[PDB]
Symmetry: D2
Subunit: 268 residues, 4 copies
Amino acid sequence: AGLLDGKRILVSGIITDSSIAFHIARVAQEQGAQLVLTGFDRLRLIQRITDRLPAKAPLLELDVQNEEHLASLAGRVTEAIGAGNKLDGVVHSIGFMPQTGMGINPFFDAPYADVSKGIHISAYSYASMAKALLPIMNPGGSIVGMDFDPSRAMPAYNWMTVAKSALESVNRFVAREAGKYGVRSNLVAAGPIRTLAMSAIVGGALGEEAGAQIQLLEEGWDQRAPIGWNMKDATPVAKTVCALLSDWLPATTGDIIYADGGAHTQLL
Amino acid sequence: AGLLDGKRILVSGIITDSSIAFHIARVAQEQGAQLVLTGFDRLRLIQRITDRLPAKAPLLELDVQNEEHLASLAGRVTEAIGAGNKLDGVVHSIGFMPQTGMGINPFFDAPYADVSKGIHISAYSYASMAKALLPIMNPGGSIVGMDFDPSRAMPAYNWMTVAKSALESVNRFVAREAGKYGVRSNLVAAGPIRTLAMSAIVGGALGEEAGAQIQLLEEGWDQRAPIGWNMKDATPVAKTVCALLSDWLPATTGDIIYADGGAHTQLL
Amino acid sequence: AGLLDGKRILVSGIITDSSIAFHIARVAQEQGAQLVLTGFDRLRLIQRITDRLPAKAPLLELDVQNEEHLASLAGRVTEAIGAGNKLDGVVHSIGFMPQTGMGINPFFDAPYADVSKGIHISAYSYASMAKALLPIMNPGGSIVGMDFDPSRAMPAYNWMTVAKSALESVNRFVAREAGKYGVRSNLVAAGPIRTLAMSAIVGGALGEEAGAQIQLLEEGWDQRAPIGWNMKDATPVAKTVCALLSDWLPATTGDIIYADGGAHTQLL
Amino acid sequence: AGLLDGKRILVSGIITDSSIAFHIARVAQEQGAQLVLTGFDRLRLIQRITDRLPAKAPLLELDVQNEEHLASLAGRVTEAIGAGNKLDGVVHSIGFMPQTGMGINPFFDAPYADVSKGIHISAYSYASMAKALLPIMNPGGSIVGMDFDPSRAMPAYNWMTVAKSALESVNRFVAREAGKYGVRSNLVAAGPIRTLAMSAIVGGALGEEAGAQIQLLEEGWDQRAPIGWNMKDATPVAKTVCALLSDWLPATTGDIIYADGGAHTQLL
Ligand SMILES: NC(=O)c1ccc[n+]([C@@H]2O[C@H](COP(=O)([O-])OP(=O)(O)OC[C@H]3O[C@@H](n4cnc5c(N)ncnc54)[C@H](O)[C@@H]3O)[C@@H](O)[C@H]2O)c1
Ligand SMILES: NC(=O)c1ccc[n+]([C@@H]2O[C@H](COP(=O)([O-])OP(=O)(O)OC[C@H]3O[C@@H](n4cnc5c(N)ncnc54)[C@H](O)[C@@H]3O)[C@@H](O)[C@H]2O)c1
Ligand SMILES: NC(=O)c1ccc[n+]([C@@H]2O[C@H](COP(=O)([O-])OP(=O)(O)OC[C@H]3O[C@@H](n4cnc5c(N)ncnc54)[C@H](O)[C@@H]3O)[C@@H](O)[C@H]2O)c1
Ligand SMILES: NC(=O)c1ccc[n+]([C@@H]2O[C@H](COP(=O)([O-])OP(=O)(O)OC[C@H]3O[C@@H](n4cnc5c(N)ncnc54)[C@H](O)[C@@H]3O)[C@@H](O)[C@H]2O)c1
Ligand SMILES: Cc1cc(N)n(Cc2ccc(C(=O)NCc3ccc(F)cc3Cl)cc2)n1
Ligand SMILES: Cc1cc(N)n(Cc2ccc(C(=O)NCc3ccc(F)cc3Cl)cc2)n1
Ligand SMILES: Cc1cc(N)n(Cc2ccc(C(=O)NCc3ccc(F)cc3Cl)cc2)n1
Ligand SMILES: Cc1cc(N)n(Cc2ccc(C(=O)NCc3ccc(F)cc3Cl)cc2)n1
């Protein structure tokens, strides 16, 4: 009797076992969901990592910048879940922004080619994925994407913040399309999490100053959050995504759910 | 098993079987929650209406404008749930605005005495209730209040909209306090529901013009909502409240969850 | 030729020469406006302060909690500006919240009588003033009120923040009424300024902690503001109010203009 | 004494005498500003259009997608205004979205190459322009961009709405940079105006359905706006831009000023 008992859910974006998608996949499986996983580029590492999940799940290659992978996606998914079966949920946990547009590099020094790559992957692909999977989604279904609140500017996140603003707008339009299928589309706006790029920044990959800025932001986050914020725990975010994948938020669409300890509602 | 299995939840605001609180109580009971109910003024009719719920629940009198009722509340609740037991959830589903500040009456013609009564009941009582019940709430607990999106002005709702703007602010401060107890505080912003005052307005209690305004509002709500909006169905709102009472939104506090069909995200 | 050349403007809220209203009145007079001033309680004291303004202006008593003062207001204003003449602008720079709802006192310890008084004066009176003066306002006219951003909760401001949330909602409804007269209604959301109450708090009136809280908030405000913030200079706020009183923002109504150094747009 | 008397302002984005930039340029010149104009692609035509302005102004070529144009921009501007002189204001009134991302074309059918072109021109170029002109801007200066409220999804505007969401984020970061120079950066969110593309859609260029959708959007805009909205009058928008270019909004940065008749503050 799990929250997602007998639901067929596609989960994208696992790279390491600290990926927000890894935790979403683990909680979904714990709550009775049957998963299809998608991975990018390093499918060998991804397979080794997905083998650690509580249950076996098919892993499919998906480069959201590749038109062939998107055109074949629904077919490859149907083959994995069985003919006659459709998805009940889709998790978009894909995001990237080159070093030139996120970190220490001046906001004015990011080349458009880099910004465009970041927007393609982090924002446009949310619509690309919905276009590919809505035809194989069941009514009452749910599409969830990952957001980082871009309503206020901040140090370091620069063009990744700009990409999240674009993602928020995309989600509102994806909801209009998803609604025709009786499917909801929402974003979970998470507080900062120590994933691959974040452990690299804090670790000094982009220099001391960038590392410091991130740590200061993580500190302020926990201060402002009335229930606190642990940047090392992705489980509260994973649980929130599963809530949206469930039938317990049935009148919420084109929306943003904040899993950030309540930090965005507090000034100081 | 049930979503709220073994949770002790206080549910305020049942007046008829159309009340949003009646549906919250029913869904909570369906999901394994042990309830304590509070009612105002006409307790014998409230008892006759709470008798229609799937399970028996103690009914306690609570006039949020009465200081004695608030000062004795925690003691009376403890007596009902048993010594040594605490609440895991609190539902504030209380709202009122006199006819002079809600309906057809010009916005400029509402006397402050009437506006103050509406703000006391609809907004201030959210803090009053939290103050009384937080000392008897368990960590991981949840306080949920009912909101009606006041970010844009609209016909008829007038001072009730003003009261909801005040309630939104109260929630953000109640979260600061509830956080000290490891308790979350949130509002569910529902779409229009045909409850007591709503069916009276539409039915022509305040005249034809007011009735027509509400109906035109309801129609536009359903149009804008990508998944539609049934103003006769409180169950999607009830399910959203239960989601917040559950452990599936554990990093959300001082916030607003929209159970409105996604109408507020769409211009037209 | 001034920005407000030949405009008849009513300015409320001067108590000292530190008052935001005193600076609004001074800049308006510098820009060619003809003023009518309103004051509360100690009118012989206010008259000594208004005597410091660049030009002579009639001073009229107005306690916004007094129904007789409001009912006679338009008549008393017309008598001061001359029969046949109407106001082109109205400045609401009135705000109060008792110590129990603003300062160090716990948020839960503010009695409703005190909260209601602050909401009556700081929020409801904005509508009261519009009701009284719109019949004696010229098309193209402007009503400006003073706001302090309540969108995120913060230390110390407590129920005054709740009152500002209610004021923001009142402004949106006053704009609906003002539109019938071809009059705009807007709020200027100012950053913290050292006025009577703020100076008293910083000086230790509510104790050492309350003092320290205001200063930390002031410090962070200047940090977040990309152009800085000086809590001792009300002139940038006064200039913004005059911009709204002018014909240079003619398609802005039911809105909020932030004169806060851009702090509310920055997280850190 | 003009509102911008003795100010040196760069105005981009004139294509026809219907362009919002044409009206901004006209009002600025009426208010004593000395202008430098930038145009894209058809310079011979733009020159004939700029010749209808109240005063002569140098016209410079600027394709925001061309890196040579941006690298030489400040030098070419300095040559036009005279050595030793700097700009006091910059107007970004540049926007474009291919037919595939704006109109009747399904939201999911816009190729990323087209979306990327639209985001480059409508959003990224705001930062590009600031990067190029901030070194030749005087303290107290102002950068103004043109926005179309993207906070709610709507018919037809599709990916142009997505680009405006990105622009709003770019503005907040441009403000951080501009602040180092004592320069403000803001957006004017205008209501729908009958400029080149808007006349073409309404006129049936993309078919009847698209034409009808814009007209129902225009109708609802006027209805919602408490002071009405005339989609044929760009002067109220032009006046708002000039207000921001002036010294009358000196504590406003990273922000959005709505010149939309107040429509965004009203639901119905
Ligand atoms: N960690 C945070 O602070 C934080 C906060 C809010 C939101 N997010 C968002 O959460 C999501 C997941 O990020 P994360 O923090 O778990 O980091 P992560 O590095 O573990 O995950 C990002 C994933 O994106 C995938 N990806 C990148 N380019 C791709 C492409 N072309 N095609 C397909 N997949 C591609 C990667 O393979 C990786 O699995 C992202 O959208 C991120 O922006 C992160
Ligand atoms: N129905 C809608 O359109 C709608 C939309 C959004 C939010 N809401 C909110 O949902 C909540 C429930 O309202 P409803 O629509 O179910 O209608 P309702 O008439 O059934 O409920 C209002 C409740 O408030 C109680 N109440 C009034 N004064 C009280 C007092 N002094 N002390 C204690 N209780 C008091 C009443 O007894 C009643 O049970 C309210 O907060 C309302 O504002 C309603
Ligand atoms: N100082 C700040 O940091 C700050 C920031 C944002 C907004 N504001 C707002 O600016 C406005 C003016 O405040 P200020 O900071 O200049 O303080 P202030 O003390 O100088 O002025 C407040 C004024 O309200 C008047 N007033 C109080 N009760 C009244 C009543 N019953 N009838 C009529 N007038 C009454 C007082 O006499 C006084 O002139 C208020 O609305 C305040 O909330 C202040
Ligand atoms: N018309 C509306 O309904 C409306 C509403 C709100 C905001 N806006 C915004 O106002 C601004 C002005 O648009 P408009 O409505 O006056 O239309 P317009 O067609 O007259 O102006 C847009 C301008 O963009 C220029 N442009 C396009 N590609 C360019 C490039 N690569 N380099 C340089 N310039 C380039 C064109 O030459 C043109 O002058 C835009 O940013 C637009 O999005 C328009
Ligand atoms: C809001 C948010 C937080 C996180 N982690 N994401 C997703 C994300 C972002 C950026 C990259 C990435 O690797 N970027 C290039 C890079 C390489 C090395 C380095 F030390 C820093 C950088 Cl920025 C990967 C994933 N989104
Ligand atoms: C946003 C919203 C919608 C609803 N229903 N609520 C709660 C609510 C509001 C008002 C009253 C009420 O009875 N008001 C007095 C009245 C009596 C008879 C009449 F026909 C109209 C009126 Cl306004 C009760 C409950 N909140
Ligand atoms: C947001 C904002 C900031 C300011 N200054 N205002 C207006 C305002 C608020 C409060 C009072 C007031 O006198 N309050 C009682 C009091 C008296 C003495 C004392 F030291 C502290 C207190 Cl709180 C007066 C004016 N609004
Ligand atoms: C929000 C907003 C409104 C307006 N007018 N702008 C600026 C803008 C947008 C689009 C284009 C454009 O020409 N797009 C390609 C096209 C050509 C012909 C056609 F009939 C329709 C289309 Cl979409 C030009 C300028 N931004």
